[PDB]
Design a protein around this ligand. Structure first.
Ligand code: CLA
Ligand code: CLA
Ligand code: CLA
Ligand code: CLA
Ligand code: CLA
Ligand code: CLA
Ligand code: CLA
Ligand SMILES: CCCCCCCCCCCCCCCCCC(=O)OC[C@H](CO[C@@H]1O[C@H](CO)[C@H](O)[C@H](O)[C@H]1O)OC(=O)CCCCCCCCCCCCCCCCC
Ligand SMILES: CCCCCCCCCCCCCCCCCC(=O)OC[C@H](CO[C@@H]1O[C@H](CO)[C@H](O)[C@H](O)[C@H]1O)OC(=O)CCCCCCCCCCCCCCCCC
Ligand SMILES: CC1=C(/C=C/C(C)=C/C=C/C(C)=C\C=C\C=C(C)\C=C\C=C(C)\C=C\C2=C(C)CCCC2(C)C)C(C)(C)CCC1
Ligand code: SF4
Ligand code: SF4
Lengths: 30, 143, 154, 88, 42, 94, 66, 80
């Protein structure tokens, strides 16, 4: 049961959030 | 004392059908370049970007995307034909910056109004070791 | 014997290899008329095989469990023919070649265009110099002592 | 003229080639429909949060409640476990 | 004639002659003394 | 505009003098080597005729004779194949 | 008085970044005009990596060797 | 922009300026060689870093040096 929660958590949600966030930080202009 | 000739718009441009090699968005928001020259006749010349264009008799104006394209075409105009050229940088504000020939004299001919830049008065082997400029912003060749 | 090996004259595996080789060539030989030239060729290979194994057995080569000669290069005096003696021969020939080539390079180095004789060989000079290699060990030893072998402060 | 230091957008080709500039072909009442209904999604930061958390929890839901008739990984092995080369 | 001997002295030609002689020699030596892992004469 | 047989007599003298001058075709290579790079250039530029001369006629003559050389080699190679077929083949048994 | 070594004299190159460093070359001409920072002109038996066989050196970068 | 420097080993043969494809270099007066001229790099913001000048220098060692440094649109040779 727990792998069905954490495998999509770190294999889909976490990479999407990290890639979007890093994209924003990397494209920012001060 | 030298006065740069101002860029005259309404100066005609060479006869050319257009190419995919010309300007892009860079010219709109960043900068582009303009080379002018005087031709004795209508000639065919190779464009630094497309194929072949027809240089017009009299003043010619040609907008290019990079400085190196202006200097390449100008080198050829001075070589194959015997043509004087100038070129400028143009910003999207309309401001123009005269670039070449900077003195009215070509830079390979020594002109006395010229000030030294980046000249180090030593052999190249006398540059210090990196450790001696470490943690300082300097580079051993900046001295 | 040495290294747990056995002399190839005493090795069953060695004789089994000679047997299987010869019977293999004879299996090829059964296909041709005995007067034919392929037949004589396979017979010559057979005689050459027997000569091979008999010579390896004679000259004292040790064999592994594989039935194949193994060479003893430790310097054991029973096996100098396996390395030390052909090795001295090699060093004589290689020293000859290098000493002669060095003699040529020294001979042409003060020419007006040295590279000219490096791409087009001065064959008369080369023929004059080839037989210096016969005495290269004395020549090089004498140069080492005299200080002509090594360039100064390099 | 094609070169004018006054207007560089024209000089550098900064045009809208296929932009229509015509008025709305969408009739109203349809427009007000979508304007009132899609309005909560027009705040970009809020939409980002709603998509990451909404889609994330949605994913967690269909993953936690999946059936073996859909995924072989939930169904688990249905055969007697085989025997290793030398071992179990 | 002098030019032809010169051409025959050039690096690749002298190399083919030299190594061709060396090859014939080594071939004939392996023809009269085939196989041989050792120097048997001691 | 009247097509006809056109040649010139004795344009190049048959001699071994330039056999002995490596890189004779190039004004730079003919000076001989100062470094080993020379040796490679001599071989990379050997058939680059339009780099040796700008005269189209000379280039065309080199090209033509070179084609003769190629055909000579091809005929020697076919001579090899037929001769080996006659002398070192099982072609009759086959 | 003449400055620098005699013309034709063999000198040892002391410039560390020179292709001919610790080698020797022959003096051609020593520019007697002062304010010239590298007056000694040396020719070499071997070309450097720029296919150049001559170079100018300072007085303290050549050491006359017989 | 790339840094470009001249060293007083320069003999003023003008070949670095002739080679430069973006006009970075000039010949200025000087008293240290016979040609009475020395190179200079007053426009390194246009320097693309191709080192044609270095290929052109006859001095041993070089009297032009191009130290490739912070990249810009001009130094990357971008027409876009
Ligand atoms: C750091 C070593 C490490 C490694 C390489 C793994 C590897 C793995 N874990 Mg595990 N895990 C670890 C530590 C580790 N874990 C720790 C310390 C705990 C708490 C006791 C867990 C608890 C855990 C659970 C409950 C599950 C996994 C699962 C898994 C597998 C699927 C990946 C996953 O679901 O995300 C991993 C999930 C986690 C909760 C890991 C985070 C735990 C700590 C805090 C790590 C720190 C993360 C931090 C925020 C980022 C640091 C980057 C990195 C260096 C860790 C995978 C092979 C799943 C599985 O077995 O699938 C079959 C599963 O259900 N892990
Ligand atoms: C890995 C270390 C090692 C080393 C370095 C050696 C070295 C040597 N071993 Mg030993 N061995 C070793 C391990 C080693 N062994 C082990 C572990 C074992 C146990 C299995 C053995 C068991 C073993 C045995 C049983 C024997 C040796 C012997 C020898 C010597 C044979 C060569 C000789 O006789 O002189 C050299 C022979 C010559 C003819 C010299 C002439 C060659 C000239 C100098 C070279 C030619 C160059 C050119 C022509 C001239 C140069 C010119 C110049 C001035 C420019 C040699 C010095 C044998 C020995 O002691 O010999 C008496 C011997 O009996 N070894
Ligand atoms: C196989 C195709 C081919 C063809 C047809 C040519 C044709 C030509 N070459 Mg080229 N060449 C080739 C291959 C070829 N080459 C290859 C593979 C290389 C190496 C990259 C070269 C490198 C080369 C160089 C460097 C030069 C030429 C030149 C020439 C021209 C000289 C013509 C001449 O004088 O004839 C020659 C007359 C003959 C009678 C030929 C007989 C020569 C034989 C082989 C003598 C060698 C025998 C030798 C002793 C071996 C026997 C020993 C034994 C043990 C086997 C000519 C048009 C020269 C030129 O002027 O360029 C325009 C020139 O300088 N070639
Ligand atoms: C460094 C690598 C190396 C070495 C040490 C050897 C060593 C040897 N090889 Mg091998 N071989 C090699 C690489 C090597 N090979 C490679 C790369 C190939 C593929 C091309 C071959 C293919 C090959 C074949 C097919 C054969 C050998 C054979 C031999 C033996 C021949 C001895 C001989 O010629 O009688 C003695 C020769 C001389 C004494 C000549 C020197 C005298 C000079 C010319 C004059 C001296 C005047 C004083 C020998 C022990 C032959 C053999 O029978 O093996 C046992 C053989 O059949 N080799
Ligand atoms: C009839 C067809 C034909 C013709 C006449 C030419 C003619 C020419 N070519 Mg072209 N070309 C061809 C086909 C042809 N090529 C093909 C099929 C290719 C694809 C590979 C090319 C690609 C090509 C390139 C990239 C270049 C040329 C160049 C040239 C010019 C220089 C030739 C020269 O001097 O090189 C001399 C010949 C040699 C140095 C021989 C090299 C030895 C080869 C690499 C190894 C062969 C391996 C061997 C067959 C197998 C192993 C045997 C070995 C172990 C002994 C010349 C005018 C060069 C040029 O500068 O143009 C002006 C050049 O840069 N060609
Ligand atoms: C019917 C007349 C005729 C024939 C049969 C040929 C045949 C050939 N020509 Mg040629 N040619 C002709 C007329 C002819 N040509 C004319 C009118 C022109 C324009 C003026 C040219 C100009 C031309 C050029 C520039 C070249 C050729 C080349 C070739 C060869 C191409 C490769 C090939 O196919 O090999 C196949 C091989 C054979 C068929 C073997 C038979 C060849 C025999 C011996 C020659 C027969 C025709 C010959 C011209 C007769 C004249 C001989 C007499 C004057 C003593 C080929 C043999 C290339 C070449 O020269 O290669 C060396 C080439 O470069 N031709
Ligand atoms: C591309 C063509 C080609 C090729 C690749 C071969 C290849 C071969 N030939 Mg063949 N041959 C050819 C053309 C060719 N040949 C032609 C045109 C003829 C005349 C019609 C012959 C007549 C011929 C005979 C009679 C024999 C061979 C033999 C051989 C084999 C051994 C070569 C050799 O003699 O060893 C090494 C070569 C030498 C030591 C000398 C080579 C140098 C010769 C003398 C020419 C150099 C001088 C030249 C004028 C410059 C070999 C596989 C031999 C064979 O089959 O073995 C059973 C053999 O008996 N050939
Ligand atoms: C910086 C790292 C450095 C590392 C240094 C590593 C060194 C490793 C060793 C190097 C030297 C090894 C020498 C091994 C000698 C082996 C010979 C041996 O010990 O047995 C002694 C050998 C034995 O010789 C064997 O004897 C057998 C019977 O017992 C059989 O007869 C064998 O055929 C015969 O080879 O006798 C000698 O011939 C050696 C003496 C020869 C004359 C030497 C004195 C001459 C003085 C001058
Ligand atoms: C020994 C043969 C000899 O000295 O040749 C000397 C001759 C002449 O030698 C050559 O002469 C040229 C001027 O004519 C140049 O001086 C060359 O440098 C020189 O090698 O060389 C040969 O032609 C023989 C090459 C092949 C020898 C073996 C033939 C089989
Ligand atoms: C005995 C033996 C052994 C051993 C060995 C050893 C261990 C050795 C050592 C050795 C060494 C350790 C050596 C050394 C070296 C050094 C040096 C320093 C060098 C040199 C050289 C030279 C100098 C050369 C010259 C020349 C000549 C002479 C000829 C040719 C030319 C030339 C120039 C090249 C073994 C067991 C293996 C085997 C058995 C036997
Ligand atoms: S690196 Fe290229 S662009 Fe820069 S100064 Fe040298 S020649 Fe000019
Ligand atoms: S190439 Fe060297 S010597 Fe010549 S002008 Fe440039 S910096 Fe001076």
């Amino acid at each position: 049961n727990l792998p069905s929660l954490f495998v999509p958590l770190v294999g889909l949600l976490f990479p999407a959030v990290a890639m979007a966030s890093l994209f924003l930080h990397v494209e920012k202009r001060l | 004392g030298f006065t740069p000739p101002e860029l005259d718009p309404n100066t005609p441009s060479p006869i050319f059908g257009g190419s995919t090699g010309g300007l892009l968005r860079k010219a709109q928001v960043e900068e582009f370049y303009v080379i002018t020259w005087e031709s004795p006749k209508e000639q065919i010349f190779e464009m630094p970007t497309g194929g072949a264009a027809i240089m017009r008799e009299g003043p010619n104006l040609l907008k290019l995307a990079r400085k190196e394209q202006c200097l390449a075409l100008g080198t050829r105009l001075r070589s194959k034909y015997k043509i004087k050229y100038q070129f400028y940088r143009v910003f999207p504000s309309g401001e123009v910056q005269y670039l070449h020939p900077k003195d009215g004299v070509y830079p390979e001919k020594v002109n006395p109004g010229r000030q030294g830049v980046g000249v180090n008065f030593r052999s190249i082997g006398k540059n210090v070791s990196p450790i001696e400029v470490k943690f300082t912003g300097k580079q051993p060749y900046d001295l | 014997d040495i290294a747990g090996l056995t002399p190839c004259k005493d090795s069953k595996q060695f004789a089994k290899r000679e047997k299987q080789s010869i019977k293999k060539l004879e299996s090829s030989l059964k296909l041709y008329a005995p007067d034919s030239a392929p037949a004589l060729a396979i017979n010559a290979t057979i005689e050459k095989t027997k000569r091979r194994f008999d010579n390896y057995g004679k000259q004292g080569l040790l064999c592994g469990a594989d039935g194949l000669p193994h060479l003893i290069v430790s310097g054991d005096q029973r096996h100098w023919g396996e390395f030390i003696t052909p090795g001295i021969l090699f060093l004589y020939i290689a020293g000859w070649i290098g000493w002669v080539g060095r003699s040529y390079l020294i001979a042409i180095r003060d020419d007006k265009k040295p590279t000219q004789k490096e791409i087009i060989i001065d064959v008369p000079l080369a023929t004059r110099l080839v037989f210096r290699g016969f005495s290269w060990p004395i020549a090089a030893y004498r140069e080492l002592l005299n200080g002509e072998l090594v360039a100064k402060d390099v | 003229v094609y070169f004018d230091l006054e207007d560089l957008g024209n000089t550098t080709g900064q045009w809208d080639l296929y932009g229509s500039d015509a008025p709305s072909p969408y009739n109203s009442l349809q427009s007000k429909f979508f304007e009132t209904f899609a309005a909560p999604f027009t705040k970009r930061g809020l939409l980002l949060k709603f998509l990451i958390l909404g889609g994330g929890s949605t994913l967690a839901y269909f993953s936690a409640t999946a059936s073996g008739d859909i995924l072989p990984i939930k169904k688990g092995p249905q055969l007697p476990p085989q025997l290793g080369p030398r071992l179990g | 004639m002098r030019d032809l001997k010169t051409y025959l002295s050039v690096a690749p030609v002298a190399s083919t002659l030299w190594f061709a002689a060396l090859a014939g020699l080594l071939i004939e030596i392996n023809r009269f003394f085939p196989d041989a892992l050792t120097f048997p004469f001691f | 505009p009247e097509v006809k047989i056109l040649v010139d007599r004795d344009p190049i003298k048959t001699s071994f003098e330039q056999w002995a001058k490596p890189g004779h075709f190039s004004r730079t290579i003919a000076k001989g080597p100062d470094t080993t790079t020379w040796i490679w250039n001599l071989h990379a530029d050997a058939h680059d005729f339009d780099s040796h001369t700008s005269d189209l006629e000379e280039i065309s003559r080199k090209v033509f004779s070179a084609h003769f050389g190629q055909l000579s080699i091809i005929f020697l190679w076919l001579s090899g194949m037929y001769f080996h077929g006659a002398r070192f083949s099982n072609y009759e048994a086959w | 008085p003449p400055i620098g070594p005699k013309r034709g004299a063999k000198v040892k190159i002391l410039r560390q970044e020179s292709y001919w460093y610790k080698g020797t070359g022959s003096v051609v001409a020593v520019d007697q005009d002062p304010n010239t920072r590298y007056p000694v002109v040396v020719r070499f038996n071997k070309v450097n990596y720029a296919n150049v066989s001559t170079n100018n050196y300072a007085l303290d970068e050549v050491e006359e060797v017989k | 922009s790339h840094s470009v420097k001249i060293y007083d080993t320069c003999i003023g043969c003008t070949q670095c300026v002739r080679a430069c494809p973006t006009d970075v270099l000039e010949m200025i007066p000087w008293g240290g060689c016979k040609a009475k001229q020395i190179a200079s790099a007053p426009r390194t913001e246009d320097c693309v870093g191709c080192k044609r000048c270095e290929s052109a220098c006859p001095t041993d060692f070089l009297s032009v040096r191009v130290y490739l440094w912070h990249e810009t649109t001009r130094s990357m040779g971008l027409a876009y």
